[PDB]
Write a protein that holds these residues in place. Structure first.
Motif, PDB file in Angstrom:
ATOM      1  N   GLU A 113     -34.694 -28.493 -18.472  1.00 22.50           N
ATOM      2  CA  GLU A 113     -33.487 -29.792 -18.978  1.00 22.50           C
ATOM      3  C   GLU A 113     -33.091 -29.829 -20.239  1.00 22.50           C
ATOM      4  O   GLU A 113     -32.023 -29.840 -19.948  1.00 22.50           O
ATOM      5  N   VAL A 114     -33.513 -30.140 -21.614  1.00 19.72           N
ATOM      6  CA  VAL A 114     -33.196 -30.099 -22.277  1.00 19.72           C
ATOM      7  C   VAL A 114     -32.340 -29.335 -22.617  1.00 19.72           C
ATOM      8  O   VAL A 114     -31.031 -29.772 -22.718  1.00 19.72           O
ATOM      9  N   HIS A 115     -32.699 -27.733 -22.155  1.00 18.59           N
ATOM     10  CA  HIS A 115     -31.592 -27.146 -22.883  1.00 18.59           C
ATOM     11  C   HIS A 115     -30.868 -26.507 -22.287  1.00 18.59           C
ATOM     12  O   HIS A 115     -29.339 -25.582 -22.777  1.00 18.59           O
ATOM     13  N   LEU A 117     -28.770 -29.047 -20.759  1.00 13.97           N
ATOM     14  CA  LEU A 117     -27.944 -30.518 -20.198  1.00 13.97           C
ATOM     15  C   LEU A 117     -26.519 -29.650 -19.982  1.00 13.97           C
ATOM     16  O   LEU A 117     -25.840 -31.099 -19.599  1.00 13.97           O
ATOM     17  N   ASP A 118     -25.957 -28.449 -20.843  1.00 17.21           N
ATOM     18  CA  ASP A 118     -24.537 -27.603 -21.061  1.00 17.21           C
ATOM     19  C   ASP A 118     -24.362 -27.620 -19.156  1.00 17.21           C
ATOM     20  O   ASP A 118     -23.179 -27.042 -18.448  1.00 17.21           O
TER      21      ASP A 118
ATOM     22  N   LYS B 167     -32.742 -37.955 -22.769  1.00 19.62           N
ATOM     23  CA  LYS B 167     -32.022 -36.334 -22.178  1.00 19.62           C
ATOM     24  C   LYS B 167     -30.696 -35.843 -21.854  1.00 19.62           C
ATOM     25  O   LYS B 167     -29.560 -36.768 -20.936  1.00 19.62           O
ATOM     26  N   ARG B 169     -26.672 -35.239 -23.886  1.00 20.93           N
ATOM     27  CA  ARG B 169     -26.203 -34.743 -25.224  1.00 20.93           C
ATOM     28  C   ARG B 169     -25.968 -35.112 -26.133  1.00 20.93           C
ATOM     29  O   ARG B 169     -26.737 -35.050 -27.677  1.00 20.93           O
ATOM     30  N   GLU B 177     -32.428 -28.419 -30.072  1.00 21.29           N
ATOM     31  CA  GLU B 177     -32.769 -29.438 -28.810  1.00 21.29           C
ATOM     32  C   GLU B 177     -34.600 -29.933 -28.626  1.00 21.29           C
ATOM     33  O   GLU B 177     -34.809 -31.039 -28.923  1.00 21.29           O
TER      34      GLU B 177
END
Lengths: 237, 300
Positions: A113-115, A117-118, B167, B169, B177
């Motif tokens: 999920e964190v990687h 976000l884009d 969570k 940007r 990350e």
């Protein structure tokens, strides 16, 4: 949310999706030191990223050099998996990017999920399915390319060989999971079933033997028998 | 010492002033609260005896104007208003005091509880979280949603707390990350402290304001915000020593004041267990850990 037996046909619809299995990313042999302490030695690993509809396997080989001088490797392994899946998605043309990524282990959810976000429109999902993708390293040609790697490498396979010429993705996935479940339960016996008849070979460009439709039914039967035999042995039932 | 007179009390109501509360009967000769300590924000709050739905109240600072309460029989609530005529106001307050129709803000001389809960809370920051610029006081109630709750619906009646999302940007630098997710120092120190709050005083002021709205109104969004601001600090490996020591004091007094019978709805088990026992700051909150372990050992 989570992918289970209720929404199983969803795997074979026309929404691009990938399974991600991280169970072979960080692999070690445990051994005694000269002083009689215990130490690990990493060996090469792999991310198992599979399109269940097409059979396209993005095998990212994890070379042991990625662990050098790092701490908390089992934690880092999840984040490196997420990094590499994110990188793969960004490398694909927009019309090839998945709409969903299903992780086989819930511990991959936050890192992925964190990687990603884009990519707010890519759904990251767990599954209640118990998938035997850990047994991928029991497929000789996949084990060989991982263990011979001297640097990070991505290798593309079709894990269904040419099966989709004759069978649906649902059936191809069912065959793949039964083969891998058997390889996971009793590797030696599974490989014996797959290779016992020398007249049936593996094409240079394939992973599995060139079985006719009738031979696949026999093979599938022998695999189910193996899994039931092993279950009778585990539980003495 | 300042005064908030009441026109009357036509409906039976429990009246809160800061951490204190009084029951007023229907048509009782109640005409307000005197001896309110200058130098602090205050909250005057209400729960009707005939409908405990909607706690509501007003944040004010008597240095900014002369405020009174008047029941509105149309909108069915005690409203705060400002009296611009100083001499009229002084004359009303003098008459009610002379007839002893006011309760006294019952502050014990030893007791720093209110200062300790409002140390960093400033009326000007309240008015930016609660936007109604024609009044110098701020209305809050049980049901008001936060800007963040509204993203996940009337914008004018919202609590504009600073959005914190681990969570997002904003919280996670491209290329960092794992580092930024497991160690929230970047998010705390660069984005929130340097970037949005400008200093730890403004951060604590919002944290303290969120707690008080949670406690006095049962405002669920406020409770979420209070926990998120605690968790952002506890989840940061790098926090100034003075901020950790101050956070320990802030939380100690919040936990000390929380009614024991409300701990089950106002305290998030996950956040408190993580902050006290797993986080980078698990060993930095001595006072808070001691009061939590002695008062709420079930939660942990």
């Amino acid at each position: 949310g989570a992918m289970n037996s209720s929404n199983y046909a969803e795997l074979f619809n026309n929404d691009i999706k990938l399974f991600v299995d991280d169970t072979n990313v960080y692999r070690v042999t445990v051994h005694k030191t000269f002083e009689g302490n215990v130490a690990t030695k990493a060996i090469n690993g792999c991310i198992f990223t599979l399109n269940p509809k097409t059979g396209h396997l993005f095998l990212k080989i994890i070379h042991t050099s990625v662990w050098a001088g790092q701490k908390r490797l089992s934690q880092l392994a999840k984040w490196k998996t997420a990094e590499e899946v994110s990188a793969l998605v960004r490398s694909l043309p927009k019309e090839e990017q998945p709409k969903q990524i299903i992780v086989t282990r819930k511990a991959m959810l936050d890192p992925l999920e964190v990687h990603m976000l884009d990519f707010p429109n890519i759904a990251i999902r767990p599954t209640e399915l118990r998938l035997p993708f850990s047994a991928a390293m029991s497929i000789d040609k996949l084990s060989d390319v991982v263990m011979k790697a001297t640097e990070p490498q991505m290798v593309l396979f079709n894990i269904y060989d040419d099966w989709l010429d004759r069978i649906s993705s649902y059936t191809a996935f069912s065959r793949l999971t039964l083969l891998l479940r058997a390889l996971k339960t009793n590797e030696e016996s599974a490989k014996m079933i797959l290779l016992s008849d020398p007249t049936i070979t593996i094409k240079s460009y394939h992973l599995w033997p060139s079985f006719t439709d009738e031979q696949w039914i026999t093979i599938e039967s022998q695999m189910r028998d193996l899994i039931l035999t092993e279950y009778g042995r585990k539980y003495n039932v | 010492m300042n005064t908030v007179p009441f026109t009357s009390a036509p409906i039976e109501v429990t009246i809160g002033i800061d951490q204190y509360s009084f029951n007023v009967k229907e048509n009782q000769p109640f005409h307000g609260i005197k001896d309110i300590p200058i130098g602090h924000v205050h909250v005057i709050h209400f729960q009707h005896a005939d409908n405990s739905s909607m706690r509501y109240g007003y944040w004010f600072d008597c240095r900014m104007g002369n405020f009174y309460i008047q029941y509105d029989p149309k909108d069915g609530l005690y409203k705060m208003m400002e009296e611009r005529d100083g001499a009229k106001f002084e004359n009303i307050v003098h008459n009610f005091k002379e007839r002893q129709m006011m309760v006294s803000y019952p502050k014990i001389d030893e007791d720093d509880t209110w200062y300790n809960l409002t140390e960093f809370v400033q009326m000007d920051k309240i008015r930016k979280i609660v936007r109604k610029d024609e009044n110098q006081f701020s209305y809050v109630d049980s049901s008001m949603t936060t800007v963040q709750e509204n993203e996940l619906s009337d914008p004018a009646h919202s609590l504009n707390y600073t959005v914190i999302n681990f969570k997002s940007r904003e919280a996670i630098r491209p290329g960092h990350e794992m580092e930024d997710f497991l160690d929230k120092s970047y998010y705390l120190n660069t984005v929130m402290l340097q970037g949005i709050f400008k200093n730890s005083s403004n951060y604590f002021g919002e944290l303290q304001f969120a707690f008080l709205n949670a406690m006095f109104f049962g405002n669920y969004g406020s409770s979420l915000q209070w926990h998120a601001m605690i968790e952002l600090i506890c989840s940061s490996a790098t926090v100034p020593k003075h901020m950790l020591d101050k956070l320990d004091e802030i939380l100690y007094y919040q936990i000390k004041t929380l009614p024991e019978q409300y701990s089950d709805i106002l305290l998030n088990e996950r956040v408190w267990n993580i902050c006290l026992y797993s986080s980078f700051q698990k060993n930095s909150l001595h006072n808070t850990e001691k009061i939590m372990e002695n008062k709420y050992p079930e939660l942990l």
